[PDB]
């Protein structure tokens, strides 16, 4: 029973590898040789945000690009006005340990998750004007690692028990459960069309998940180590995943294999966060050695280095219009870098 | 642009109120000390939290000693895979590691030693100081007195081992029991001392998990940790 299933699984894996090898007629690097390189990108810190006590693990951007949400491990969730460096909202957290925060595309709600396994959704449009817990999501056996908003009604969350779940916020019950992981799902990134999302886990594989169907269409196995962060290319056809093996890898959904590996010999430290610009030409990678690298997605060279953080860069976020980049690190500072 | 000025004034007033609340919270946060409790499933971590107080992912215990606020976090409904979320606890003041010593049969002590080694050797946990509690001394004493011993079979070095002179034995305790307890303590010390170059230090205590003074020990250890940090700050140590 076990022997036949394992042999059949190995044969299927070999068939998938052979198909991927057949598809790889020419690499991305070979095609992009005759492309004008971007050059050095001298981003500067236009704004610095102050008022975080503990380390800032995650941040999310608004669709309007005016407001951002930063999660900290002090028990405080802060909504920041990026232009004027003003704190729009300060929210006390029931659990001190919060690893993820999300901002709704409408802007009405803000949900944060942590080690308590409970995702808390806060309504910002309360008539009294004070922040309150709109709803609390229990029912995760693992730690909640990431959450993203499809809309006001439905939220997608990442958990530490190798599961991703879709929750209907009005009911408070999971709409669907994604249970195809063997490793802790560090993060998930929604596509712009919101039909599909990709999740990165500790099993060194990224999964493409269909929100309505509930099964994983594709499995990407090209990483040596744990996948800390996953991000989508702006069209939604490709995604880039950071990892602890100091390699960012770009995977294409239609190719169903890794198009490119972004690595440097001096860089051995792990990659906490990966984000994309509005064009997708530049891939922004956060690191453990206190700096963020701007990578040319076509040429696979380091376009720029952002060195303004005392402690390791936990999260990297890019606005939807692409105007500025907000970087959160463990030194309790949010630095905004503009090209 | 009168409306824009009014909106900016309202934002500044809101920011000022939020900053005042953050300053009060900052004072409370800086005054408070965060402790992470990590222990094995067979180990009596729940017994220690029950004494400390006198489906959720994490358990928080709030206690104050000598007008010093301590928040202790105990891992509850979590997966056995611990590497990603252990990084979150580097910012705390101390990690209280509890190990159960036994002398289905598995080498739990070696697993505990490996876990302590991993915590000590973790990149971001290099700053954190580990307070070590050796649980279940009564069980060790009963097992050694009975004459059947697992630690001797598991450890070849234990057989050719001498009790350290700096160690203080209780009068009621058997010499063999003291040798086993100090040997386990020395194994943790050898890992902590060899691995770490003075950035952080390991405090070992002998407990049966029914002990009133445990909280006091934690307080003393926490005070010592801050003192060592101050000594590190002014480049003494």
């Amino acid at each position, epitope marked *: 029973e076990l022997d036949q299933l394992r042999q059949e699984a190995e044969q299927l894996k070999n068939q998938i590898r052979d198909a991927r090898k057949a598809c790889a007629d020419a690499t991305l690097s070979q095609i992009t040789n005759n492309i004008d390189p971007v050059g050095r990108i001298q981003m500067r810190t236009r704004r610095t945000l102050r008022g975080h006590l503990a380390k800032i693990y995650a941040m999310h951007w608004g669709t309007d690009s005016r407001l951002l949400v930063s999660a900290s491990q002090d028990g405080k969730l802060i909504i920041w006005d990026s232009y004027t460096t003003n704190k729009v909202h300060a929210i006390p957290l029931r659990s001190s340990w919060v690893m993820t925060c999300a901002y709704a595309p409408s802007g009405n709600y803000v949900a944060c998750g942590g080690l308590d396994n409970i995702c808390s959704i806060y309504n910002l449009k309360t008539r009294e004007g004070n922040v309150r817990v709109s709803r609390e999501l229990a029912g995760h056996t693992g730690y909640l690692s990431c959450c993203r908003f499809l809309d006001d009604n439905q939220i997608v969350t990442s958990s530490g028990d*190798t599961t991703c779940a879709l929750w209907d916020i009005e009911t408070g019950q999971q709409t669907t459960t994604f249970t195809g992981h063997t490793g802790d799902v560090m993060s998930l990134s929604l596509a712009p069309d919101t039909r599909l999302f990709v999740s990165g886990a500790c*099993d060194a594989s990224a999964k493409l998940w269909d929100v309505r169907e509930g099964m994983c269409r594709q499995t990407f196995t090209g990483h*040596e180590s744990d996948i800390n962060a996953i991000c989508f290319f702006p069209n939604g056809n490709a995604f880039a995943t950071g990892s602890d093996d100091a390699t960012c890898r770009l995977f294409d959904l239609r190719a169903d294999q890794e198009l490119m590996t972004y690595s440097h010999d001096n860089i051995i430290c792990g990659i906490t966060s990966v984000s994309f610009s509005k064009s997708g030409r530049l891939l922004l990678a956060g690191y453990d050695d206190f700096n963020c690298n701007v990578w040319d997605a076509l040429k696979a060279d380091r376009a720029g280095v952002l060195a303004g953080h005392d402690n390791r860069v936990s999260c990297l976020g890019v606005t939807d219009d692409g105007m500025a980049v907000a970087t959160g690190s463990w030194d309790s500072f949010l630095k905004i870098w503009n090209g | 642009t009168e409306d824009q000025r009014n909106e900016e004034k309202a934002q500044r007033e809101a920011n000022k109120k939020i900053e005042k609340q953050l300053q009060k919270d900052k004072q409370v946060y800086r005054a408070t000390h965060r402790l992470l409790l990590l222990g094995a499933g067979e180990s009596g971590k729940s017994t220690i939290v029950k004494q400390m107080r006198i489906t959720s992912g994490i358990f928080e215990t709030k206690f104050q000693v000598d007008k010093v606020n301590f928040h202790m976090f105990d891992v509850g409904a979590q997966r056995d895979e611990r590497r990603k979320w252990i990084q979150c606890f580097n910012d705390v003041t101390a990690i209280i590691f509890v190990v159960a010593s036994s002398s289905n049969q598995t080498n739990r002590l*070696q697993e505990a030693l*490996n876990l302590f080694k*991993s915590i000590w050797n973790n990149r971001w946990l290099r700053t954190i100081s580990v307070i070590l509690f050796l649980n279940k001394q009564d069980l060790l004493a009963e097992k050694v007195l009975a004459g059947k011993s697992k630690i001797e079979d598991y450890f070849p070095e234990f057989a050719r081992y001498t009790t350290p002179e700096d160690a203080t034995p209780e009068p009621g305790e058997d010499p063999r029991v003291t040798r086993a307890k100090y040997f386990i303590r020395d194994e943790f010390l050898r890992i902590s001392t060899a691995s770490g170059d003075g950035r952080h230090y390991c405090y070992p205590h002998f407990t049966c998990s029914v002990d009133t003074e445990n909280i006091r020990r934690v307080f003393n250890d926490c005070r010592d940790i801050i003192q060592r940090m101050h000594l590190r700050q002014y480049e003494l140590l």
Partner: nanobody
Amino acid sequence: QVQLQESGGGLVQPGGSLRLSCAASGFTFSNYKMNWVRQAPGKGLEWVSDISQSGASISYTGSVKGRFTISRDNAKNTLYLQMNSLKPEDTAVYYCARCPAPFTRDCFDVTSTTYAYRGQGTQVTVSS
């Protein structure tokens, strides 16, 4: 794709010498410290031995200390375990495991109930 395959095992008499070979695919072998973990029947996983990136620093469980030899060949991309003077307690499934991050000393989740960077393992049984 990270895959570890175990070669060798089966049935061994007590006192016999058994060599366990681990084949590594999908990662750079030199960057990772690697260890052997054994699961006895009806018992939990227990760490047996580890060898570092360079191979100079090697640590063993005391029960297997002086009895098992672990060597890593970077060029042949292979992990070798040498077993001699085996005991009836020694019978267990042997799993080949890799530390999760490169260039690091910590191994948090190598001994854990479901860990994705270990091989399927080969049954080793010792019969007197």
